Amino acid sequence: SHMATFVELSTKAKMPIVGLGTWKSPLGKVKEAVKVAIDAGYRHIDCAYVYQNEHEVGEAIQEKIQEKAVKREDLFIVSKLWPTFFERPLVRKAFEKTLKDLKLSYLDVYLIHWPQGFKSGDDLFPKDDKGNAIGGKATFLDAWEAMEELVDEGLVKALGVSNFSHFQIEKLLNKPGLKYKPVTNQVECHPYLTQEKLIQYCHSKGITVTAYSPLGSPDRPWAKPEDPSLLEDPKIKEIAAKHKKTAAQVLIRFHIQRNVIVIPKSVTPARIVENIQVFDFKLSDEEMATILSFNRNWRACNVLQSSHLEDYPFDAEY
Numbered sequence: 001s002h003m004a005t006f007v008e009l010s011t012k013a014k015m016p017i018v019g020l021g022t023w024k025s026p027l028g029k030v031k032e033a034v035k036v037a038i039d040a041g042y043r044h045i046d047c048a049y050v051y052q053n054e055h056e057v058g059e060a061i062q063e064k065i066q067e068k069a070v071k072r073e074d075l076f077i078v079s080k081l082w083p084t085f086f087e088r089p090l091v092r093k094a095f096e097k098t099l100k101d102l103k104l105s106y107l108d109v110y111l112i113h114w115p116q117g118f119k120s121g122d123d124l125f126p127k128d129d130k131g132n133a134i135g136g137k138a139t140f141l142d143a144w145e146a147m148e149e150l151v152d153e154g155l156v157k158a159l160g161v162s163n164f165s166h167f168q169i170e171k172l173l174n175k176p177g178l179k180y181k182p183v184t185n186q187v188e189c190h191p192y193l194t195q196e197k198l199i200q201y202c203h204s205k206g207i208t209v210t211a212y213s214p215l216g217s218p219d220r221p222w223a224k225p226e227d228p229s230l231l232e233d234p235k236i237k238e239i240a241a242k243h244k245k246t247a248a249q250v251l252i253r254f255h256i257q258r259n260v261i262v263i264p265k266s267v268t269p270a271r272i273v274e275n276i277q278v279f280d281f282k283l284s285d286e287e288m289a290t291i292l293s294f295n296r297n298w299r300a301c302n303v304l305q306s307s308h309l310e311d312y313p314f315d316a317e318y
């Protein structure tokens with residue numbers, strides 16, 4: 001039986017430092033994966049409207065509660081608002097659909113998924129006549145305002161952001177009449193993209209960081225063979241064997257020792273268990289410095305090249 005360390009948020013709520021990622025987890029597999037994760041000791045699940053698997057995640061959560069395998073109060077469920085729903089009435093609708101699918105009465109954290117607003121309508125990925133993303137009417141500051149109302153009504157415990165640069169976080173914090181501060185910024189992070197400056201900034205403002213794609217998202221559709229590959233990095237593997245651990249476990253531990261929340265995804269039962277077995281070893285200061293030195297400023301997940309729209313996050317240095 002396993003328990004992930006708590007990272008305290010600015011609201012005093014406790015966020016498990018390891019959670020389960022659910023992106024690309026297919027229907028027919030994610031239910032069992034969540035069941036396995038909960039049995040193994042995971043209490044933090046990372047979800048999203050756009051992953052379109054939340055109802056299956058909801059079933060597994062409900063069945064485990066009925067089973068008395070776990071209590072709601074000890075689960076930590078995160079989902080995300082997709083940018084085609086930034087317009088106020090759509091925030092509540094998308095949120096409601098997420099909450100129904102998940103079979104919950106509240107979410108622990110609700111994130112802005114991506115800072116650029118997209119055209120509303122039936123398409124989740126609106127493009128023009130070329131494959132160019134079409135922007136929306138509402139900005140992420142508009143969406144936030146509607147999201148704050150969710151917190152006022154007890155439906156969500158805390159808010160956060162995903163894929164924000166420090167400029168965009170600045171914009172959020174400086175917003176007039178801000179009711180709630182983000183408790184986390186969820187961003188890609190791993191040894192090829194160390195986010196030293198972004199992490200430094202977020203921490204200085206009492207904002208935690210959640211590391212996504214910590215294994216380098218090998219199952220991402222657009223992966224190319226020549227693309228750098230963290231799980232096969234001989235230097236990572238060599239630090240692993242010294243601790244009698246797998247590479248995946250080092251990659252996960254790396255975030256833990258920087259106090260960064262981390263959410264590796266798997267639908268494979270043995271890997272789900274292996275991924276939370278990371279509290280029984282410690283990387284030395286030297287080993288941490290070596291891994292930090294692998295930074296390549298490489299983004300595994302950067303399929304959105306919508307730099308024509310305002311608030312493209314990745315043009316900024318951090």
Ligand SMILES: NC(=O)c1ccc[n+]([C@@H]2O[C@H](COP(=O)([O-])OP(=O)(O)OC[C@H]3O[C@@H](n4cnc5c(N)ncnc54)[C@H](OP(=O)(O)O)[C@@H]3O)[C@@H](O)[C@H]2O)c1
Nearest residue numbers: 021022023212213214215216217219248264265266267268
């Ligand atoms: N914009 C955003 O906010 C955003 C973007 C991307 C991801 N995320 C979140 O972060 C989560 C994690 O990122 P990600 O899904 O991109 O990828 P990732 O967790 O870095 O890697 C997932 C891949 O690694 C494999 N894997 C898992 N554990 C392994 C192990 N112990 N040994 C070997 N292979 C292993 C998985 O295989 P199997 O599943 O087949 O075992 C899957 O192919 C996502 O699921 C999502 O919740 C958020």
